[PDB]
């Protein structure tokens, strides 16, 4: 804790913790955006996806079940970090409100994903396999540990940690979000694609907020440091979608998927105030 | 941290943090109740209370402004405790979900109260006086410090702390909630009484959950310890409504108000599994 007192975002200068005397309208506006986007899992009708999961092909279910499992855990990893870290560190009221809402929405996301799994896998045995993917699946573990490491890293500053999770919510979900949107295009799994639209939207907002926090940070990682955290996330995600769980299992081109991950990484870099790293176009017309 | 490993609620046995494999339906049900009660401040129309605040009498505005100020802070005190303590300690998924939602609703409550103040006090000078009541007002400080002390108490167990905050959200708000319902009966301040109905309801739910957590606690304070925490809260609250801010300022009988505080304290004791302390009837027919 060196020059932390000079951080408007972290400095212990509240001695207020009131609300309306809003100091940061940009942060508050983000929070209001999130509030108005509130939804509950009960709002997604799954009373019809059981049949769709049947018409599906063996390779497809394999891909989906694995993607869902990866989601059933990730949402939790993010949530823990927000609870025992970010929401603790940040002393700015507006930010605390946004983080408080993000937490609630992440739990709704968790519930949504568990609800999906239960609907498709009625066998309580396979259910446990997917629910404990963090330990039952090595592929999902490489990513789980990556994010988990940023939670227990007592050295990494808030600046590095905020970029790492922006990468988790942005790069680690990008491939899966794109895979689901692809299915929607193919007219498959209405329940899965509908919830995916609400979730992807929330993650996009959570990512934009992360970048906004980064900007309110005075002493933050150097550009090179940011490029490597983001780049490590891109490689991890690409390997996951081209080796561990090839998008070919659902009729997607591995190469195009690789390009999309780089595209998403570049947008994140721009939102953080830096230049692009890969300089590639968005290969998917249904993701713009 | 003696025998904490034997606490199902606190023991670090998650290694799951998934959701649907619900273990405690009673806790989950509480969370679902809270979720369905969601509301935003934007849902309360205040485009008419400015006139009502005028027709009000000098003593009445004095009472209200002071009650609101007490609220603008309390909601924050509770929130901080939930963020840097309860939500941290509890490892049970269902409980974490409820606490995550409580936090979000408390911030909406804060916003609602600040919105009310701004509407009634257009003078930014008096605004600051009420917003920083924790330091600008001694009366509200005695209560603020009481709750604040339970946050920084590194000795008090979760059991004691959970009872203390159940007392804050139940006993410390009781008098003020009753005062507002009294105004509603007198047909005054529609904006204030409407929001009061949504808030009081949420606090009641937050109190019931506190009692439910207490029950899931194996090693908790002895009944005598519970009676004194609750009793200290009753005396503090009574003094506040009969000396610091006499309910007489709004046409209420000090004695009856004293009896209501004791009534509320007794209900809390019953919800915790103990016998009543005061054994008094609810003196207000508009509070049943
Ligand atoms: Co998120
Ligand atoms: Co509350």
Curated annotation (Swiss-Prot), chains A, B:
Catalytic residues of the enzyme: 113
Q: Which GO terms describe its molecular function?
A: ferric iron binding; identical protein binding; protein homodimerization activity; ribonucleoside-diphosphate reductase activity, thioredoxin disulfide as acceptor
User: What is the designated name of this protein?
Assistant: Ribonucleoside-diphosphate reductase subunit M2
Listed binding positions for Fe cation 2 are 106, 169, 203, 206
Report the record's Gene Ontology biological process terms.
Answer: 2'-deoxyribonucleotide biosynthetic process; blastocyst development; deoxyribonucleotide biosynthetic process; deoxyribonucleotide metabolic process; positive regulation of G1/S transition of mitotic cell cycle; protein heterotetramerization; ribonucleoside diphosphate metabolic process
Q: Which cofactor does it need?
A: Fe cation
What binding details are noted for the cofactor? Binds 2 iron ions per subunit.
Source organism per UniProt = Mus musculus (Mouse)
Domain of life the protein comes from: Eukaryota
Q: What does this protein do?
A: Provides the precursors necessary for DNA synthesis. Catalyzes the biosynthesis of deoxyribonucleotides from the corresponding ribonucleotides. Inhibits Wnt signaling.
Q: Where is this gene product found?
A: Cytoplasm; Nucleus
Any one GO CC term of this protein is: ribonucleoside-diphosphate reductase complex
Q: What kind of modification does the protein receive after translation?
A: Ubiquitinated by the SCF(CCNF) E3 ubiquitin-protein ligase complex; leading to its degradation by the proteasome.
Q: Where does Fe cation 1 bind?
A: 75, 106, 109, 203
Enzyme Commission number(s) of this protein: 1.17.4.1
Listed under subunit, the entry gives: Heterodimer of a large and a small subunit.
Q: Does the keyword Cell wall biogenesis/degradation apply?
A: no
């Amino acid at each position: 804790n060196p020059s932390v007192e000079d951080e408007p975002l972290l400095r212990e200068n509240p001695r207020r913790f009131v609300v309306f005397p809003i100091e940061y309208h940009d942060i508050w506006q983000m929070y209001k955006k999130a509030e108005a986007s509130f939804w509950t899992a009960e709002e997604v009708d799954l009373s019809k996806d059981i049949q769709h999961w049947e018409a599906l092909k063996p390779d497809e279910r394999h891909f989906i079940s694995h993607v869902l499992a990866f989601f059933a855990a990730s949402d939790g990893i993010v949530n823990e970090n927000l609870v025992e870290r970010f929401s603790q560190e940040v002393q700015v009221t507006e930010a605390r409100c946004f983080y408080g809402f993000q937490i609630a929405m992440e739990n709704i996301h968790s519930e949504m994903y568990s609800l999906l799994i239960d609907t498709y896998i009625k066998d309580p045995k396979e259910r446990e396999y997917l629910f404990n993917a963090i330990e039952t699946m090595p592929c999902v573990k490489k990513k789980a540990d990556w994010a988990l490491r940023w939670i227990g890293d007592k050295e990494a500053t808030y600046g590095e940690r905020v970029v790492a999770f922006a990468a988790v919510e942005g790069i680690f979900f990008s491939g899966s979000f794109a895979s689901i949107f692809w299915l929607k295009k193919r007219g498959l799994m209405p329940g899965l694609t509908f919830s995916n639209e609400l979730i992807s939207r929330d993650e996009g907002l959570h990512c934009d907020f992360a970048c906004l926090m980064f900007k309110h940070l005075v002493h933050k990682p150097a550009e090179q440091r940011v490029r490597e955290i983001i780049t490590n996330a891109v490689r991890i995600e690409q390997e996951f979608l081209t080796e561990a769980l090839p998008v070919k299992l659902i009729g997607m081109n591995c190469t195009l998927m690789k390009q999309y991950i780089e595209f998403v990484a570049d947008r994140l870099m721009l939102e953080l105030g830096f230049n692009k790293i890969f300089r590639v176009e968005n290969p998917f017309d249904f993701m713009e």
